[PDB]
Symmetry: D2
Subunit: 216 residues, 4 copies
C-alpha cells in the first residue's frame, strides 16, 4: 500500500517490514517485555555512538522497478538479499527508461534537450526491433537480449536491514551519485522514514554523511 | 506466544517474524500479488529441490535465546545473521549456570556416580561465583572480575536470521555430530520454523536437510 | 610468481593477479598449525574436510582475478555476494569501448531462419549504431553517465575480483553447469582452470565430493 | 613470522599476507600494471571513502587469546575463523598493575592471587572429571573464561580497519585493546601507506593516534 513512482516507468513499492523503532530498542536491551521519551533517547544514544547492530533487527522487503544501469549500482550492496525477475517463473515485459528533456537541462548541449531524448528513444526502438527479429528467426532469448540497451527496465525484490539501508542511503542519497539512483534513494528514504521515524531522525541527525536528505 | 524452555534455565523465544512461505513464492516470481495453493506449494518444493535458495532469504525471524556461553560460542560462529548480546550498560545482568542432570551423564562409563559429577560441577560453580562476588565487593570492576566465571554461565541474545541461513544452522546443529546441548536448541528453532513456514520446512526436510535428527524426532 | 591469463570470447579474459596460500593453507587452518607438507595425511585431511562439508578451512585460500567480460556476464557474476569487486571507472584510468559479438559457430546449434553469419552481422550493426549514437551524444555535450544508457549489454567491462576458495567452489557449482548461459560457462571454465593449477588437491577433492555441476568433469 | 606477545601467555602471529599497498592501487585502477603517485592515490581513496580497493589486501593471523577476548573478537563477521578443536590448558592471570587504578579494599597482588587460586581449583576439578571418565566437552564447562584458545583469522584490510576502529579504542576492554595494537603493528609494517592514510582519514578510535 506504499508505492512511489520513479523516473518514467519505474517504482519502489514496500512489500513487507518486520518491526519498527522499538525493535532496535528491544534488541539493544535484549528484552521481549511504556515510555516513549526514554525509548527515543536510547535510539538517539545508539546512533551517535555507532552502536549500529541493534538496527539490524529492523528488516524491509521492497519491490523495485529500475533500469539496468541503476540496478547494477544498487546490486553492489552485498549485505542484503536480491531476487531478479526471470522469465523462468513469471512473464517478462520490455520497457525502457527515456530521460525527460528537463533531466538534461542543466547541461549546455549542441543539440536541444528534446533531440537527446528522441535519439535515446530511436536506439531503443531499433535495438528492440532487432531483438524481436532475432527471436523470430530462432536465436534464443538469452542470446538475443545482449543487443538491448542498459536503460531496459528490470524488477527485483530487495530485503535489507535498517543498518544496511542506512549505509545504502549514505552512498546513494547524495548529490554525487547519478541522478537516477538519487531518486530511488529518496524513495527508499521516504518509506524508511514512514516506518521508523525515530531511527530516521536520529540517522539524519548523527550518522548521515550525504546531503540530499537535508534538502528535499 | 512461542517460548520453549531448553536445558535447566535456557529458552528459545520467538520475538518476530517477517513473512511466511508465500514470501518466498512472491520473491521468486518478483511480484507482490492471484494466490493458488497447489501451485505455490509446488513452487516451494521446486526451489528447494533444484537449490534455488535465494527466495528463502526473504523470510526473516528474530529469536530471543537464553543459553550457556559454551553453547553461545558455537552458535555465534554462524556469521550470516545479526546478534545482540546482553551487556548490560543497557539492562541488568543476572548469574545462572548450566548444571547437567545426572540423566545427561549416564551412558558414559565413569568411575564415579553420575550424581557425584553433578555435585562436583555445582560445587566448583558455587566457588567461582563466590570469588567473583568477593572481587566485586572489593572494588574490582565487573569486566575484570567475571573472567573467573565458568563457561556454563548463561547469557542472552537476540538473533535475527533469514530462513536460508536458518536452514544452514539446522543442517549443522540439528545433527548427532553437534554437541547434545546445541542439538536441543536447534530442535526448538526447528519447531518454531516449522510452525511459521510449514511448507518450506517440509521441503527442506525432503530435499535439502543433511542432518539426521529432524527426520526422526517429530517437530 | 603467480600470473596466468586465459582468453575468453572474442576480446575477454580472466587473469590471475595474486593468490594467498595453497592446499596446505587449508590444512594449517583446520589444525591451527604450521605444517608444511606427511603428504598422505595432508591429502587425506583435504578429502576429509571436503566430504563432510567442513569448508571453513578453504576460506583461508584466497585469489585475486582481473576479469574482462561483457556487462551481461558481469551482472550474473556480481550476484556472488561473498567476495570483493572493483570495477573499472574513468576516474582512475582509461575507459575503452569494445563489444562482444558472438561467432557464427556459437549460433549454429540453433535451427535459425537465417544463416548464422547474418545473425552475427545484425548484432554487429545494431551495436555499431548504438555506439555511434553514444559518441554523437558525448560530442553534443551530454554527460557520459547519461549518454552511456544507450549502450548494449554486450559492452565489455573490467573488474578485480578477490574471492576465497570456498566461495569460489560455490561460484563453480552455479556457473560451471550446462544450464548456465554458454558465455558464463566459458568464464567458469577459466576460473576452474586457474583454481586447479593453484590448488590441485582442493580442486580434485571438490570434483569428487562436492562439485554439483556437469561440465568440469568433461 | 612476525610474532608479538600479548598479556601473560598470549600472542598474535602473522601466518600469511596477500598483497601490499600496491594491491589496493592495482584494484582501484583495475590494471595489472612512481612511488608518490601511488601513495597519493591511497590517500585519495581513504579520504574520499572509496574503501573497496582495500578489500584486495588480505591477512591470515594466528592468535592465542583468552576466551573472553576471543568471543568479543569473533563478533567481527566479515572474516574467516578456524579455532583449535581436538589441546593445552593455560589461563590469563591479570598483573597487579592491571588492577591498580580503582580504589580496591585489598591489595592488587591479593586480587591476582585470588584469581589464580580459583583458576587452579577449577582446572583441578576439570582434571578429576576427565580422570573419572566424563567426556571432555562436558567436563570443560567448569573452566573459566580466562582459558586461552587459539584460532586462525583471515581478514581483508578494509574489515581489518573496521576491527581497529572498534577494538583499538579506550571503550573496548584493556585486553582486546592490547591485541588490537599488535594487529595494528603488523598491518602498518606490511601496508605502511594504507595504515598512515587510515589514521589520517578514516580511523575513529583514539589510542592509535598516540600509541606508536
Ligand atoms: C567516492 C567513491 C568512488 C568509488 N569509485 C568506484 C569504482 O571506480 N569502482 C567500483 O567498483 N566501485 C567504486 N566505489 C564503490 C561503489 O560505491 C560500490 O558500488 C559500493 O561502495 C559498495 O558499497 P559497500 O561495500 O559499502 O556496501 P555493502 O556491499 O552493502 O557492504 C556494507 C558494509 O559492509 C562491509 N563489507 C561488506 N562486505 C565486505 C567485505 N567482503 N570486506 C570488507 N568489508 C565488507 C563494508 O564495511 C561496507 O561498508 C566508489 C565509492 C565511493 C564512495
Ligand atoms: C566498545 C564496544 C562496546 C560493545 N557493546 C556491545 C553490546 O552491548 N552488545 C553486543 O552484542 N555487542 C557489543 N559490541 C560488539 C559490537 O556490537 C559488534 O558486534 C562488533 O564490534 C562487531 O562490529 P561490526 O558489526 O562492525 O563488524 P562485522 O560484524 O565484521 O561487520 C563489519 C561491517 O559490515 C557490515 N555488516 C556485516 N554484517 C551485517 C549485517 N548482517 N547487517 C548489516 N550490516 C552488516 C557493517 O556495516 C559493519 O561495518 C561492542 C563493541 C565495542 C567495540
Ligand atoms: C542466479 C542466482 O540465483 C544467483 O546469481 C545466485 O543464486 C547467488 O549465489 P549465492 O547467494 O549462493 O552466492 P553468494 O551470493 O556469494 O552467497 C554465497 C553463500 O553465502 C550464503 N549467503 C550469503 N548471503 C546470504 C544471505 N543474505 N542469506 C542467507 N545466506 C547467504 C549462502 O549460503 C551462499 O551459499
Ligand atoms: C559438528 C561441528 C564441528 C565443528 N568443529 C569446529 C572446529 O574444530 N573449529 C572451528 O573453528 N569451528 C568448528 N565448527 C564451526 C564451523 O566450522 C562453522 O564455523 C559453523 O558451523 C558455521 O557454519 P557456516 O560458516 O556454514 O555458517 P555461516 O557462517 O552463517 O555461513 C553460512 C554460509 O555462508 C557462507 N559464508 C559466510 N561467510 C563466508 C566467507 N567469509 N567465505 C566464504 N563463505 C562464507 C558459506 O557458504 C556458509 O555455508 C564446527 C561446527 C559443527 C557444526
Amino acid at each position: 500500500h506504499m508505492k512511489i513512482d520513479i523516473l518514467d516507468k519505474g517504482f519502489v513499492e514496500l512489500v513487507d517490514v518486520m518491526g519498527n523503532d522499538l525493535s532496535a530498542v528491544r534488541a539493544a536491551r535484549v528484552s521481549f517485555d511504556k515510555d516513549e521519551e526514554r525509548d527515543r533517547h536510547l535510539i538517539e544514544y545508539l546512533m551517535k555512538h555507532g552502536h549500529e547492530t541493534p538496527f539490524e533487527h529492523i528488516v524491509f522487503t521492497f519491490h523495485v522497478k529500475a533500469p539496468i544501469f541503476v540496478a547494477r549500482q544498487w546490486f553492489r550492496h552485498r549485505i542484503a538479499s536480491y531476487n531478479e525477475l526471470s522469465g523462468r517463473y513469471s512473464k517478462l515485459s520490455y520497457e525502457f527508461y527515456i530521460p525527460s528533456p528537463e533531466r538534461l537541462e542543466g547541461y549546455k548541449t549542441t543539440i536541444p534537450p528534446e533531440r537527446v531524448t528522441e535519439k535515446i528513444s530511436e536506439i531503443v526502438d531499433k535495438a528492440y526491433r532487432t531483438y524481436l527479429e532475432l527471436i523470430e528467426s530462432g536465436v534464443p532469448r538469452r542470446v538475443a537480449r545482449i543487443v538491448l540497451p542498459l536503460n531496459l527496465y528490470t524488477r527485483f525484490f530487495w530485503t535489507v536491514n535498517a543498518r544496511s539501508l542506512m549505509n545504502f542511503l549514505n552512498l546513494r542519497a547524495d548529490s554525487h551519485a547519478q541522478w537516477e539512483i538519487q531518486q530511488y534513494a529518496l524513495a527508499i528514504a521516504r518509506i524508511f522514514k514512514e516506518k521508523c521515524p525515530w531511527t530516521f531522525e536520529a540517522f539524519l541527525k548523527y550518522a548521515y554523511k550525504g546531503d540530499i536528505l537535508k534538502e528535499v
